[PDB]
Amino acid sequence: GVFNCETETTSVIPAARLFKAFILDGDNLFPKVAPQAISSVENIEGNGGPGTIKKISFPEGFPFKYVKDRVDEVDHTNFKYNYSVIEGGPIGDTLEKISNEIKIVATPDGGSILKISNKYHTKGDHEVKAEQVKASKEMGETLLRAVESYLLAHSDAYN
Amino acid sequence: GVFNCETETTSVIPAARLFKAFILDGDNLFPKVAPQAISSVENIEGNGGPGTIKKISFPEGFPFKYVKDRVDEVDHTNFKYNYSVIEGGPIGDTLEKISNEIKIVATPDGGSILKISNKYHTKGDHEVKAEQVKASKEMGETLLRAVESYLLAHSDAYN
Protein backbone atom coordinates (compact mmCIF):
# COMPACT_ATOMS: atom_id res chain seq x y z
CA GLY A 1 0.00 0.00 0.00
CA VAL A 2 0.99 3.67 0.06
CA PHE A 3 0.62 6.57 2.45
CA ASN A 4 1.98 10.04 1.47
CA CYS A 5 2.55 12.75 4.29
CA GLU A 6 3.39 16.38 2.74
CA THR A 7 4.50 18.99 5.26
CA GLU A 8 5.97 22.44 5.13
CA THR A 9 8.24 24.21 7.53
CA THR A 10 9.84 27.67 7.45
CA SER A 11 13.35 28.83 8.19
CA VAL A 12 14.92 32.25 8.59
CA ILE A 13 17.98 30.95 6.71
CA PRO A 14 18.15 31.67 2.99
CA ALA A 15 17.54 28.61 0.85
CA ALA A 16 21.02 28.36 -0.75
CA ARG A 17 22.83 28.50 2.61
CA LEU A 18 20.41 26.06 4.23
CA PHE A 19 20.85 23.61 1.34
CA LYS A 20 24.63 23.73 1.69
CA ALA A 21 24.49 23.05 5.43
CA PHE A 22 21.38 20.88 5.99
CA ILE A 23 21.70 18.79 2.80
CA LEU A 24 25.23 18.99 1.39
CA ASP A 25 27.04 18.89 4.78
CA GLY A 26 24.44 17.02 6.85
CA ASP A 27 26.64 13.92 7.30
CA ASN A 28 29.11 16.13 9.13
CA LEU A 29 26.70 18.47 10.87
CA PHE A 30 23.98 16.20 12.21
CA PRO A 31 26.10 14.26 14.72
CA LYS A 32 27.62 17.59 15.87
CA VAL A 33 24.47 19.70 16.21
CA ALA A 34 21.99 16.97 17.17
CA PRO A 35 24.01 14.24 19.01
CA GLN A 36 20.97 13.28 21.03
CA ALA A 37 19.32 12.20 17.74
CA ILE A 38 22.17 11.07 15.45
CA SER A 39 25.42 9.46 16.58
CA SER A 40 27.07 8.99 13.17
CA VAL A 41 26.55 8.97 9.42
CA GLU A 42 28.82 6.78 7.31
CA ASN A 43 29.18 5.74 3.71
CA ILE A 44 28.43 2.20 2.89
CA GLU A 45 28.59 2.50 -0.93
CA GLY A 46 29.07 5.57 -3.21
CA ASN A 47 30.17 9.26 -2.86
CA GLY A 48 27.10 11.22 -1.58
CA GLY A 49 25.32 11.63 -4.90
CA PRO A 50 22.53 9.52 -6.40
CA GLY A 51 22.81 5.80 -5.57
CA THR A 52 24.87 6.30 -2.43
CA ILE A 53 23.97 4.10 0.56
CA LYS A 54 24.50 5.69 3.98
CA LYS A 55 24.31 4.13 7.46
CA ILE A 56 22.74 6.53 9.99
CA SER A 57 23.32 5.39 13.57
CA PHE A 58 21.30 6.51 16.58
CA PRO A 59 22.74 7.00 20.06
CA GLU A 60 22.36 4.58 22.95
CA GLY A 61 18.81 5.31 23.89
CA PHE A 62 16.69 4.41 20.94
CA PRO A 63 14.31 1.67 19.91
CA PHE A 64 15.96 1.75 16.48
CA LYS A 65 19.78 1.31 16.31
CA TYR A 66 20.33 2.52 12.74
CA VAL A 67 18.86 2.93 9.32
CA LYS A 68 20.37 2.59 5.86
CA ASP A 69 19.27 5.29 3.43
CA ARG A 70 19.83 5.61 -0.30
CA VAL A 71 20.33 8.95 -2.08
CA ASP A 72 17.90 9.05 -5.02
CA GLU A 73 18.36 12.55 -6.55
CA VAL A 74 20.21 15.80 -5.76
CA ASP A 75 19.51 19.07 -7.57
CA HIS A 76 22.08 21.67 -6.52
CA THR A 77 20.43 24.47 -8.49
CA ASN A 78 16.86 24.03 -7.31
CA PHE A 79 17.72 22.75 -3.84
CA LYS A 80 16.05 19.35 -4.04
CA TYR A 81 17.14 16.22 -2.21
CA ASN A 82 15.37 12.87 -2.53
CA TYR A 83 16.40 9.87 -0.48
CA SER A 84 14.85 6.60 0.67
CA VAL A 85 14.92 4.68 3.92
CA ILE A 86 15.65 1.16 2.73
CA GLU A 87 16.69 -0.96 5.75
CA GLY A 88 16.62 -0.87 9.53
CA GLY A 89 14.55 1.24 11.88
CA PRO A 90 10.88 1.18 10.78
CA ILE A 91 11.59 -0.99 7.72
CA GLY A 92 10.43 -4.55 8.27
CA ASP A 93 7.34 -6.70 8.19
CA THR A 94 4.84 -3.87 7.76
CA LEU A 95 6.86 -1.34 5.68
CA GLU A 96 9.04 -1.90 2.61
CA LYS A 97 10.55 1.55 2.04
CA ILE A 98 10.06 5.24 2.81
CA SER A 99 10.70 7.56 -0.14
CA ASN A 100 11.40 11.13 0.95
CA GLU A 101 11.67 14.41 -0.97
CA ILE A 102 12.95 17.72 0.44
CA LYS A 103 12.74 20.91 -1.56
CA ILE A 104 14.06 24.15 -0.08
CA VAL A 105 12.34 27.14 -1.61
CA ALA A 106 13.57 30.73 -1.25
CA THR A 107 11.19 33.38 0.06
CA PRO A 108 11.27 37.02 -1.13
CA ASP A 109 12.43 38.14 2.33
CA GLY A 110 15.58 35.95 2.18
CA GLY A 111 14.36 32.94 4.20
CA SER A 112 13.13 29.58 3.09
CA ILE A 113 10.17 27.22 3.05
CA LEU A 114 10.87 23.54 3.04
CA LYS A 115 8.41 21.34 1.21
CA ILE A 116 8.82 17.78 2.57
CA SER A 117 7.18 14.58 1.39
CA ASN A 118 7.38 11.28 3.29
CA LYS A 119 5.96 8.42 1.19
CA TYR A 120 5.43 5.11 2.90
CA HIS A 121 5.50 1.98 0.75
CA THR A 122 3.68 -0.39 3.04
CA LYS A 123 3.88 -4.13 2.71
CA GLY A 124 0.59 -5.40 1.28
CA ASP A 125 -2.46 -4.03 3.13
CA HIS A 126 -0.55 -2.70 6.15
CA GLU A 127 -1.32 0.77 7.48
CA VAL A 128 1.33 3.20 8.70
CA LYS A 129 0.61 4.19 12.28
CA ALA A 130 0.03 7.92 12.89
CA GLU A 131 2.73 7.77 15.59
CA GLN A 132 5.28 6.63 12.96
CA VAL A 133 4.31 9.41 10.53
CA LYS A 134 4.68 11.87 13.42
CA ALA A 135 8.06 10.45 14.46
CA SER A 136 9.52 10.96 10.99
CA LYS A 137 8.15 14.50 10.78
CA GLU A 138 9.55 15.33 14.24
CA MET A 139 13.02 13.92 13.43
CA GLY A 140 13.25 16.14 10.34
CA GLU A 141 12.12 19.22 12.27
CA THR A 142 14.57 18.46 15.10
CA LEU A 143 17.47 18.27 12.63
CA LEU A 144 16.33 21.43 10.80
CA ARG A 145 16.08 23.45 13.99
CA ALA A 146 19.49 22.22 15.18
CA VAL A 147 21.13 23.22 11.88
CA GLU A 148 19.33 26.59 11.89
CA SER A 149 20.53 27.34 15.43
CA TYR A 150 24.09 26.38 14.46
CA LEU A 151 23.97 28.66 11.40
CA LEU A 152 22.75 31.63 13.46
CA ALA A 153 25.54 30.97 16.00
CA HIS A 154 28.19 30.71 13.23
CA SER A 155 27.41 33.61 10.94
CA ASP A 156 30.14 32.87 8.35
CA ALA A 157 29.46 29.18 8.06
CA TYR A 158 28.28 27.97 4.65
CA ASN A 159 28.46 31.37 2.96
CA GLY B 1 -5.87 8.04 24.60
CA VAL B 2 -4.40 11.12 22.92
CA PHE B 3 -2.69 11.91 19.65
CA ASN B 4 -1.48 15.49 18.93
CA CYS B 5 -0.67 16.55 15.21
CA GLU B 6 1.12 20.15 15.03
CA THR B 7 1.49 21.59 11.53
CA GLU B 8 2.48 24.89 10.04
CA THR B 9 1.44 26.52 6.83
CA THR B 10 2.32 29.89 5.27
CA SER B 11 0.20 32.52 3.62
CA VAL B 12 1.02 35.65 1.65
CA ILE B 13 -1.88 37.39 3.42
CA PRO B 14 -1.03 39.49 6.46
CA ALA B 15 -2.11 37.89 9.72
CA ALA B 16 -4.73 40.50 10.75
CA ARG B 17 -6.54 40.35 7.40
CA LEU B 18 -6.40 36.56 7.27
CA PHE B 19 -7.81 36.32 10.80
CA LYS B 20 -10.74 38.58 9.89
CA ALA B 21 -11.59 36.52 6.80
CA PHE B 22 -10.58 32.91 7.64
CA ILE B 23 -11.64 32.98 11.31
CA LEU B 24 -14.05 35.84 11.98
CA ASP B 25 -16.02 35.52 8.69
CA GLY B 26 -15.44 31.82 7.96
CA ASP B 27 -19.12 30.88 8.49
CA ASN B 28 -19.96 33.16 5.57
CA LEU B 29 -16.91 32.56 3.41
CA PHE B 30 -16.38 28.81 3.52
CA PRO B 31 -19.58 27.79 1.72
CA LYS B 32 -18.89 30.51 -0.89
CA VAL B 33 -15.20 29.89 -1.58
CA ALA B 34 -15.10 26.12 -0.98
CA PRO B 35 -18.60 24.76 -1.83
CA GLN B 36 -17.12 21.43 -2.83
CA ALA B 37 -16.02 21.02 0.82
CA ILE B 38 -18.59 22.91 2.93
CA SER B 39 -22.27 23.34 2.08
CA SER B 40 -23.33 25.42 5.11
CA VAL B 41 -22.40 26.60 8.58
CA GLU B 42 -25.18 27.35 11.03
CA ASN B 43 -25.58 28.31 14.65
CA ILE B 44 -27.04 25.78 16.93
CA GLU B 45 -26.42 27.62 20.24
CA GLY B 46 -24.58 30.92 20.98
CA ASN B 47 -23.22 33.96 19.02
CA GLY B 48 -19.82 32.90 17.52
CA GLY B 49 -17.71 33.43 20.62
CA PRO B 50 -16.61 30.88 23.23
CA GLY B 51 -19.22 28.19 23.94
CA THR B 52 -20.98 28.52 20.60
CA ILE B 53 -22.07 25.28 18.93
CA LYS B 54 -22.01 25.30 15.12
CA LYS B 55 -23.32 22.72 12.63
CA ILE B 56 -21.01 22.38 9.60
CA SER B 57 -22.68 20.52 6.75
CA PHE B 58 -20.87 18.83 3.87
CA PRO B 59 -22.20 18.64 0.32
CA GLU B 60 -23.81 15.59 -1.25
CA GLY B 61 -20.75 13.53 -1.88
CA PHE B 62 -19.21 12.81 1.45
CA PRO B 63 -18.89 9.91 3.84
CA PHE B 64 -19.62 12.35 6.67
CA LYS B 65 -22.83 14.46 6.44
CA TYR B 66 -21.99 17.06 9.10
CA VAL B 67 -20.10 17.82 12.23
CA LYS B 68 -20.97 19.91 15.28
CA ASP B 69 -18.11 22.05 16.54
CA ARG B 70 -17.80 24.12 19.69
CA VAL B 71 -15.88 27.42 19.89
CA ASP B 72 -13.50 27.18 22.85
CA GLU B 73 -11.49 30.46 22.76
CA VAL B 74 -11.06 33.48 20.46
CA ASP B 75 -8.24 36.02 20.88
CA HIS B 76 -8.81 38.93 18.51
CA THR B 77 -5.52 40.61 19.40
CA ASN B 78 -3.18 37.66 19.04
CA PHE B 79 -5.15 35.91 16.29
CA LYS B 80 -5.90 32.66 18.08
CA TYR B 81 -8.93 30.46 17.54
CA ASN B 82 -9.56 27.23 19.44
CA TYR B 83 -12.50 24.99 18.65
CA SER B 84 -13.47 21.35 19.16
CA VAL B 85 -15.17 18.78 16.98
CA ILE B 86 -17.72 17.31 19.37
CA GLU B 87 -20.27 15.29 17.35
CA GLY B 88 -20.72 13.78 13.91
CA GLY B 89 -18.16 13.00 11.24
CA PRO B 90 -15.18 11.16 12.80
CA ILE B 91 -16.61 11.35 16.33
CA GLY B 92 -17.97 8.00 17.44
CA ASP B 93 -16.88 4.68 18.83
CA THR B 94 -13.14 5.24 18.44
CA LEU B 95 -12.85 9.04 19.01
CA GLU B 96 -14.44 11.23 21.68
CA LYS B 97 -13.41 14.73 20.58
CA ILE B 98 -10.89 16.63 18.48
CA SER B 99 -9.53 19.79 20.11
CA ASN B 100 -8.05 22.21 17.58
CA GLU B 101 -5.97 25.38 17.95
CA ILE B 102 -5.15 27.85 15.15
CA LYS B 103 -2.74 30.69 15.71
CA ILE B 104 -2.00 33.11 12.87
CA VAL B 105 1.39 34.71 13.30
CA ALA B 106 2.58 37.76 11.35
CA THR B 107 5.86 37.57 9.44
CA PRO B 108 8.19 40.58 9.04
CA ASP B 109 7.48 40.66 5.29
CA GLY B 110 3.71 41.15 5.85
CA GLY B 111 2.52 37.55 5.42
CA SER B 112 1.58 34.95 7.95
CA ILE B 113 2.44 31.55 9.38
CA LEU B 114 -0.35 29.48 10.77
CA LYS B 115 0.48 27.22 13.67
CA ILE B 116 -2.22 24.50 13.82
CA SER B 117 -2.73 21.80 16.41
CA ASN B 118 -5.18 18.90 16.00
CA LYS B 119 -5.52 16.94 19.26
CA TYR B 120 -7.39 13.67 19.12
CA HIS B 121 -9.04 12.46 22.32
CA THR B 122 -9.41 8.81 21.47
CA LYS B 123 -11.81 6.51 23.25
CA GLY B 124 -9.82 4.22 25.54
CA ASP B 125 -6.88 2.54 23.76
CA HIS B 126 -8.00 3.39 20.22
CA GLU B 127 -5.47 4.74 17.73
CA VAL B 128 -6.22 7.52 15.26
CA LYS B 129 -5.58 6.31 11.73
CA ALA B 130 -2.94 8.24 9.76
CA GLU B 131 -5.53 8.71 6.99
CA GLN B 132 -7.81 10.56 9.45
CA VAL B 133 -5.01 12.83 10.66
CA LYS B 134 -4.21 13.57 7.00
CA ALA B 135 -7.86 14.25 6.14
CA SER B 136 -8.17 16.90 8.86
CA LYS B 137 -4.91 18.55 7.83
CA GLU B 138 -6.00 18.58 4.15
CA MET B 139 -9.44 20.06 4.94
CA GLY B 140 -7.81 22.96 6.81
CA GLU B 141 -5.32 23.59 3.99
CA THR B 142 -8.11 23.43 1.38
CA LEU B 143 -10.11 26.07 3.26
CA LEU B 144 -7.03 28.26 3.81
CA ARG B 145 -6.06 28.20 0.15
CA ALA B 146 -9.64 28.97 -0.93
CA VAL B 147 -9.82 31.98 1.40
CA GLU B 148 -6.36 33.17 0.30
CA SER B 149 -7.36 32.98 -3.38
CA TYR B 150 -10.57 34.90 -2.63
CA LEU B 151 -8.63 37.61 -0.77
CA LEU B 152 -6.17 38.05 -3.65
CA ALA B 153 -9.11 38.29 -6.10
CA HIS B 154 -10.92 40.85 -3.88
CA SER B 155 -8.21 43.27 -2.86
CA ASP B 156 -10.40 45.48 -0.62
CA ALA B 157 -12.08 42.67 1.22
CA TYR B 158 -11.40 42.50 4.97
CA ASN B 159 -9.21 45.61 5.09
Numbering used by the authors:
A (entry chain A), B (entry chain A): 1 to 159
Quote the study that presented this structure, word for word.
Partly conflicting data on the allergenic significance of dimerization were reported for the birch pollen allergen Bet v 1, an outstandingly well characterized model system in immunology. It is the archetypical representative of the pathogenesis related protein family 10. Cysteine polysulfide bridging stabilized different dimeric assemblies, depending on the polysulfide linker length.
These crystals belong to an alternative space group (C2) and diffracted to a resolution of 1.17 Å. In this nonasulfide structure, the dimer axis coincides with the crystallographic 2-fold symmetry axis, with the central sulfur on a (crystallographically) special position. The packing resulted in one molecule per asymmetric unit. Although both the tetra- and nonasulfide linked dimers exploit the N-terminal strand β1, their quaternary arrangement differs considerably, as evident by the C-terminal helix. Most strikingly, the nonasulfide linker connected the distance of more than 12 Å between the cysteine Cα. The linker must be compatible with transiently formed quaternary arrangements, which are conversely hyperstabilized by a compatible polysulfide linker.
